[PDB]
Design a protein around this ligand. Sequence first.
Ligand SMILES: NC(=O)C1=CN([C@@H]2O[C@H](COP(=O)(O)OP(=O)(O)OC[C@H]3O[C@@H](n4cnc5c(N)ncnc54)[C@H](OP(=O)(O)O)[C@@H]3O)[C@@H](O)[C@H]2O)C=CC1
Lengths: 321, 312, 328, 330, 319, 318
Amino acid sequence: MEYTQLGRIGLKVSRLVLGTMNFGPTTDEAESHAIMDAALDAGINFFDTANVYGWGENKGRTEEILGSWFAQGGDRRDKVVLATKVYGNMGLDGPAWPNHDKLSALNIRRSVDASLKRLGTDHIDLYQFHHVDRDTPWDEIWQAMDVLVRQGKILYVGSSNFAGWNIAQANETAARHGRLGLVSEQCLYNLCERRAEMEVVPAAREYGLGVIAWSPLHGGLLGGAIRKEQEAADALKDPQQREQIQRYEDLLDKHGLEPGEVALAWLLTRPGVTGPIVGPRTADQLASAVRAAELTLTDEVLTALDEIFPGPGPSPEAFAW
Amino acid sequence: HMEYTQLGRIGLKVSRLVLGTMNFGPTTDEAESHAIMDAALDAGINFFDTANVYGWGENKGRTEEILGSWFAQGGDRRDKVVLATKVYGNMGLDGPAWPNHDKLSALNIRRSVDASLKRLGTDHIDLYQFHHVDRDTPWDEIWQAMDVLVRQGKILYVGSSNFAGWNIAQANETAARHGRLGLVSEQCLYNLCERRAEMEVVPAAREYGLGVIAWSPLHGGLLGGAIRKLDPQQREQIQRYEDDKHGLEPGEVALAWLLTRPGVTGPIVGPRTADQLASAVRAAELTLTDEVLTALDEIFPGPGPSPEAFAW
Amino acid sequence: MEYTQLGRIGLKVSRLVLGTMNFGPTTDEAESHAIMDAALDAGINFFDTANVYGWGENKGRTEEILGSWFAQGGDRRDKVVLATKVYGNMGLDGPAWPNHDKLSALNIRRSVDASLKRLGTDHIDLYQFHHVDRDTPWDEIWQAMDVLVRQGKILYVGSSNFAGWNIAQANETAARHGRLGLVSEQCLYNLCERRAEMEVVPAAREYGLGVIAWSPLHGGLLGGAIRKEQERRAASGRAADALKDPQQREQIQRYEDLLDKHGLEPGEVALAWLLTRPGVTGPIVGPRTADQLASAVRAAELTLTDEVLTALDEIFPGPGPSPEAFAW
Amino acid sequence: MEYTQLGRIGLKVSRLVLGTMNFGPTTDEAESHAIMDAALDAGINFFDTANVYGWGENKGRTEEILGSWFAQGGDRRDKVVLATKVYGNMGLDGPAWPNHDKLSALNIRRSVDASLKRLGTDHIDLYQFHHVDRDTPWDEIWQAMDVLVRQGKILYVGSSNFAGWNIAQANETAARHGRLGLVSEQCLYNLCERRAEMEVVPAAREYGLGVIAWSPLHGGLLGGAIRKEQEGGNRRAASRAADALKDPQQREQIQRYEDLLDKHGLEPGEVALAWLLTRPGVTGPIVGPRTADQLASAVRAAELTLTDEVLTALDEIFPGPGPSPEAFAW
Amino acid sequence: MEYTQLGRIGLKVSRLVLGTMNFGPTTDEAESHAIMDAALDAGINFFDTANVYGWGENKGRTEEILGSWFAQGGDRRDKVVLATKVYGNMGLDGPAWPNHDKLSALNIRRSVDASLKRLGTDHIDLYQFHHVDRDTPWDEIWQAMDVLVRQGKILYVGSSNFAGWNIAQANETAARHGRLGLVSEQCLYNLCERRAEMEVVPAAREYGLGVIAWSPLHGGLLGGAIRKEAADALKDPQQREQIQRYEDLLDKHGLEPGEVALAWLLTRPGVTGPIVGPRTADQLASAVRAAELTLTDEVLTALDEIFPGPGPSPEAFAW
Amino acid sequence: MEYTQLGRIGLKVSRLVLGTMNFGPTTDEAESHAIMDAALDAGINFFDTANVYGENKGRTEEILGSWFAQGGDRRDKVVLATKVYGNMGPAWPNHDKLSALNIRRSVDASLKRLGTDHIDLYQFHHVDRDTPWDEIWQAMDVLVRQGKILYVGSSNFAGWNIAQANETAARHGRLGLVSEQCLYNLCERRAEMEVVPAAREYGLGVIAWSPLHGGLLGGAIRKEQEGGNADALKDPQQREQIQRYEDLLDKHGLEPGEVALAWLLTRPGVTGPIVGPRTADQLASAVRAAELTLTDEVLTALDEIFPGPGPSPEAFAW
Ligand SMILES: NC(=O)C1=CN([C@@H]2O[C@H](COP(=O)(O)OP(=O)(O)OC[C@H]3O[C@@H](n4cnc5c(N)ncnc54)[C@H](OP(=O)(O)O)[C@@H]3O)[C@@H](O)[C@H]2O)C=CC1
């Protein structure tokens, strides 16, 4: 298994990040524990979850399943870098009660509290914002994170679904008063959606953040979608995206490569990318993700992939000069 | 149903009505207070204002005790409310305080928040407010004491009440020097009869991004139907105000008028019945015409900002 | 009773500070308790003690006597601003085991924990360095004090037996990172010893520290020691050595004669004088009896005339501030 | 016993530092306790240990031996400046599991908690990085140490096996935000290996760190190793490690050393220690007695006064470099 | 001509730095002028000088030659990144009058004004400390350099012959009060002398300084010294043997010693480039060829075994 | 000639400081110039003057100016120190003391008289309790940045003034005071209570003025007994100190004036004494005093005769 520093910090993580979103709604408790044991066996030490995972009435269920996993002992907690998230509404689906979503110091205090209890652990290694909150200023956010840092309840802070300039503002404000800033950004990044390349990834590289790609298969659209319908994806409605996926599936047919694996290995070549979040439901899907991390894509396949799935390049050049 | 706003520049979202709490104890009883709070919650009011001195005399603290009773019932009550209380007041025998048993020394702040947390039956206050400026305590002392509480998780935010504008500036410049969040709100005396917050308090609050909470929004009930059930000048000002020509109830218009003022978060309302609360709710939905605002401005003129209020 | 702000900070204190050094080695526990009750009854809210007080094998006795006073209830702890000290050796008298005296963060951690236990309280209001430690830098000291402030174990930090430039360096270092600095300096200052006037008091005034004067009667020398010489702290220590030096002896003789003539008591005048000195918060009185405490209270109501102030200045000239004190 | 301040800070330490490496592997629990009690009686108040001490499956055994020492009472914990270390892999020897070695905030947090539990104490006086970690930035390290300071789990932070410029960067970063920086550096420094003089000791002195010399006898090569080879007579026929001092350049240095010391009547183990005590900016050497007898010998080396003739001749045998840049440029 | 950034800053410099030490005491005005025009022609934009160059009673002569060169117009001044130095005694050789050497604000002020006058220009681009001064604190030094920056007499500050920790202290002090720190360090670094790798180069890399290698041929000892029979170190059998293995190997691969020593430096991590000291047009052309040379990995490997480096501290002496 | 760093900074100065106050009517312009050339010849590079030196105020600075105008590298070799604070005209408001207004006009008048474009060391002549340091540092920082001055020094400060000044300077990157001129000699040692300990903490040079205590340490009892024309020689106890001092020096064959200067050079943190020779034989006597080595026996005896106070707080408390 390949390891890398998470951006600029001393933390070392697996380039494959185990996502936990399916633990609860798809795989049951014991099945999820087995997948986590097997991720560990393959050397994956980086586990991403969220308070909202579980969905609907079951929000928090994913954290509970990792909690019972840690409760089996055998150094599981000691060995994993535990990441979870704050921002999302934990009450009834629909419009949240005020301050029961987003990034106020008040929601941060109550959110991390409920996460620690469901996770059955006394600390979170990587506490991430699930989305930028334009209404909370960074001196409030860093006050609330710093309370947690100094109680030993969290080690590191990261973001998800930020703009590039939010990364810059967040870390400049942290650095002004001697605080470690964001250590990582979780952005939607895959062959079909490359616009994090304009500004999010350049800002992250500048400020030394790890870049973790969520929806690395674009919701399955890059995992052999077309071949599976012959045996969201309202993209296979639009014939331009459909023809794009077709050329992709055809291209990988002639190089003998699995699309679900190629999509992951492609992200691993991109400058600044720490790795994709993989969400296997079975032992075969985990082993396939591991193979994707050992794949070496030829220049030939990389060039043709860029021809099918062009990227915008960095701003300002992407739209001006 | 209820209108919400950010509290000044910060991430906290509050209802534009602030549930006052001073009646709980003296006027309404524990059972009636509990039921008004349950009602406020169901109308969407999340912002409750209280003070340690509330209850008065030998009953100072009774109000905080009543809110603790309410929280102890469970049912997401503590979780749903932005709880604001106050420090400054003597909690001992009325009359001259023993030294450091009132005002804002780090010593009185330590003893006040401990006694407030115990009576409130909660491990934290969301918004801990100075009841009054203390000219004798410097801001590096006050911010030390508040930072001890912030870092213990005992409080989240700091607000002020009865500050001058320049105290607001000094307090927040001092906090920002060393990374700390400053005052997030100022609770000032603001209503149609008393507009001198407009000279400097409200302008400083808006420059520093504080929410403005208006206490005594009906000027002691003088703006809520007085001569239609104290003087020769005061009466005929109110009489022009209380003149049906436009079809509106005075008490609700005094609240709604404050909601039009730039920088104002909302007023502190103090309902004693669920029907008074339902009126306050409608006050927050009212739209006053450019008509009625221009006329209110001639009955109750305001000073404007300094320096123009008194120079040019 | 007159109250004042302690220097620039919001803490209000009585202009008389109750000293406790006598409680244990010269005044027993029960009468210590009576004096403290009388002090509280007269409006004195500011008590000074030290870990070392008690002396010898009884170092810590004074704190323990304060502890059992608080334990009697009646709001005593809540009403009193409690000050103690760190620096002194709490082990066997003589050369200290390394880091069991002075102001390292290590001695600070162990010293405050033992003080809180002997005082039977969870916080000290005013925690004072007993003496400057030239070997500990201020970033180490402010680290250790800041740990205590953030845990709630102390509120304020003060100094004792500092030079003026130590006050400056300390508070400039604290302010650089937004810490409240020293709030008070407890220095030797009385009619017989006025050299804190050169730099310590000017620096304290500049930086807004309170100034509380220790041994305000010079160990009882200024309390009628000559009249009382054959019948007591004045029979020992500072006072007794001063009485054997003829010039100091003469100074005190002129002092007791001047007060005989004006119908005033020496102990009370010595305290009243300190109360006139600019920047002085108050003297730390050292009653051995309840009588002497009621006497200090009378001192706090005395008004000295210009005539008396000028004659005292003639007997007990002071240097005034540096650089003028020794240059121009 | 001679005391000194540890660099610029208020902490006072004996100029002999009691190393504990041999407690567990070569000395057993009860003799380790007796050595620590005899160190205290000689005035030594400065104990240096490490989480890794113990070796192999027994990593942490040394910290446990100190813990049972402290648990005897008698003001033992109160009298000792306790130092330990973080950086080393505490699991099975070999490649470490990610973040189970080096200086991430994650490993600092788990390493100190495990050391406090083994040491049977609620705080460490001097918590030292065993080695520079080029992959962890100083705002991450200082955040982790600052959490421990503010919780009261540690008092002072030190380094070991740093470059001079790591010392400067660490303490400049700490000073920016009012944090006390490194108070001490533990570098390899002895007659045979003097290259710490180029930049490590200069930087430590500029920034006011104490300098603690580890391996002051260069693994025993300055402790009379050549005489010790010809020691047993017939015992050398036994079925015994190969002799380790083969580099002829260094072997002749050691011969000249032992001859010089024979000429002047001095003990090689004592001189190596006392020499370090003359070097500018050095606090003291770490002494690793395996017996009460070895301790008395180190204590004698602390009271030894080396004549200027012997100091001159030792310098001729073991020349140091200058400070940089002069050592290699001008 | 290969260009690079000078460490972390926006200044772009050729990977060859034109030294001017020989201008005066070896080449005279007219020929140094030709060497400088030819350096411009090959794309070299980075000229290194010093106030002391010229030697003895001719100290300042080199700067005077650059001044007479710039006075010929033709965009010479505009095209060149001009670097000079302060620290050296500019008076009578031997013991210096107090404050007429080293880095006091006193010596800095008189030193830069005399340099500017001799260079015939109103600004120096890169003003370098010739050597660390352990007796002048960095708040004094940065005060003096900041005066020169704000008056527009200098743009960047650099160092020469610092220890690694001096680089760190210098730039941490500058950054605390909003000053650009050192942008480059000039160290003795070549195949024969690699101890800059212990700490100096690693500190420069951490703080983003360019690394300029001076005496890259070790006094000419690496430019074919034994065939063409300070660099007189040849007496020592140990080093003369290094040099013969060196010349022998490059004879076998068909390579010129003076060009390999330069090209080797261009492969070292964090190195900006060597300062070359041509006395003729032939030597400049040679250095240019050196900047174009690609050393194979078996030559770099054999050069390593002949000229081992220490590696970085602490590993170099401990672990 | 012995040199030293001026406190913590990179400036190197001779441990004798040539004062210019005693340039007067027994001292030509021409004889002042000769003395200054002789000082340069002896290796003294540190010249101290003041604007008020000279009702004929500024004349001293003018004499230095014409000295510099002779050329011969005189300006370039000398570390030139002058002062601001004194009235140069009861003073008209802001024509004395340390306001930015008086600093600006004083330095301009000083540079004109001195006939130079810069002062190396510009010193406050006295503490000004009414001007805050952020004002003072603004005005000095303007001069630093214009190149008109290099370093700032103090004179007749309290130790806590030194601390406050340099802490304030360092907050915003500025070089603080580099030197303090204080009254300091065997008879007056109270600068050891706080001034010198602060100066040493903050790394200032200490320049001792009135090093002979107005001549009291220059053999004043011998001169009285020899007959023919401050007086503490009427004070019995102060007289006995000076008598013990002159007896001690007679027994060891040492000159009172020279020993007073040599003693100061042994004191911790002292850069040197100001000397104001009116003749060239007085200068050579000062140079010999800087060469003298006082035995430890003599230094112990001088401490018995002239006990120091110790540092505060120990000086008066414990
Ligand atoms: N920080 C430091 O270094 C020090 C601090 N302190 C603090 O200062 C306090 C006071 O010091 P202390 O030396 O006791 O003070 P004093 O100088 O007042 O000496 C006390 C003695 O003065 C006499 N006395 C006290 N009050 C009166 C009165 N009203 N009328 C007449 N005589 C009186 C009594 O002498 P007699 O018994 O002879 O009648 C008494 O024992 C101490 O309690 C301690 O807290 C003290 C010493 C050092």
